Design a protein around this nucleic acid. Structure first.
Ligand SMILES: [Zn+2]
Ligand SMILES: [Zn+2]
Lengths: 160, 154
DNA sequence: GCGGCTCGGA
DNA sequence: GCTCGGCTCGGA
């Protein structure tokens, strides 16, 4: 029962952007930055095509959010991403000072929001970013499993 | 290989003065691959409305365009300031070979100070670290920006 | 040594 | 794994 402007509502737009990365032969990850139930930034992985090692879905949304906000600080915003953020994106989330990150499926190998580490809730950091996970995880995992050529029942098998 | 660390750090300090002229954090970075400059950068986050426009990110982005590849193997990144969590993570994704910074970020540094994400176990890539290159001149720029005495920083 | 310190929500 | 390798792009 997904209501408009719910976590699943925004995650489905983020999943629609992940299909764009899939069509572009990239890692099928999409991201949507939401502030007061309004989209201020969208993005998907374009690193291979743009020759940008930082062109992850979360970065493309944060850069767009800063332009839309005319401010490199994006307080009280919520970032939706289909994949658990890496160290790069989680570190960028701290600098933009967003309010929460909502991701779908986990990166059990190198995830930096609970999996390999938790840089967002690291002690000593200038800002703490709240974490919500599991939103449409089955649909986010299906996209990446087909990209990485893996059956779904092996992606994060220890959590199942 | 060819040039010395102080040679390239002198170039990175020149770029940090450009960020200083732009009323930004005076941090500059130069990306070197096979003793040739493939990327330059300085902090431009306030002017570009970019939360990621750190010196290292702008230098790495430029390197990816020059190399037409989002992977920048065997390159060495020079920066006047210890990389943050965001910038250190970008070096892992770019798969650079070494990061050389001058002064340390004792508060939130992610290359030895607050943490070491470059040498974290479990990561796909390990980035070597060299520090202290022209540390006095890198610290002077940030101390004057942060309005702090030199004998307090670190 | 403006406030309080690694941009001003450091 | 109506079987590409080896698994969280192919230097995963
Ligand atoms: Zn990322
Ligand atoms: Zn940085």
């Amino acid at each position: 029962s997904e209501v408009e402007f719910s976590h699943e509502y925004w995650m489905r737009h983020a999943l629609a952007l992940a299909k764009r990365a899939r069509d572009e032969r990239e890692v099928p990850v999409g991201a949507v930055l939401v502030l007061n139930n309004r989209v201020i930034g969208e993005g998907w992985n374009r690193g291979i095509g743009l020759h940008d090692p930082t062109a992850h879905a979360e970065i493309m949304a944060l850069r767009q959010g800063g332009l839309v906000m005319q401010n490199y600080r994006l307080y009280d915003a919520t970032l939706y991403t289909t994949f658990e953020p890496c160290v790069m994106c989680a570190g960028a989330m701290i600098h933009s000072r967003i309010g929460r990150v909502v991701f779908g499926v986990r990166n059990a190998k190198t995830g930096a929001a609970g999996s390999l580490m938790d840089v967002l809730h690291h002690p000593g950091m200038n800002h703490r970013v709240e974490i919500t996970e599991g939103i449409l995880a089955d649909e986010c995992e299906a996209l990446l499993c087909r990209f990485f050529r893996m059956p779904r029942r092996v992606f994060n098998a220890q959590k199942k």
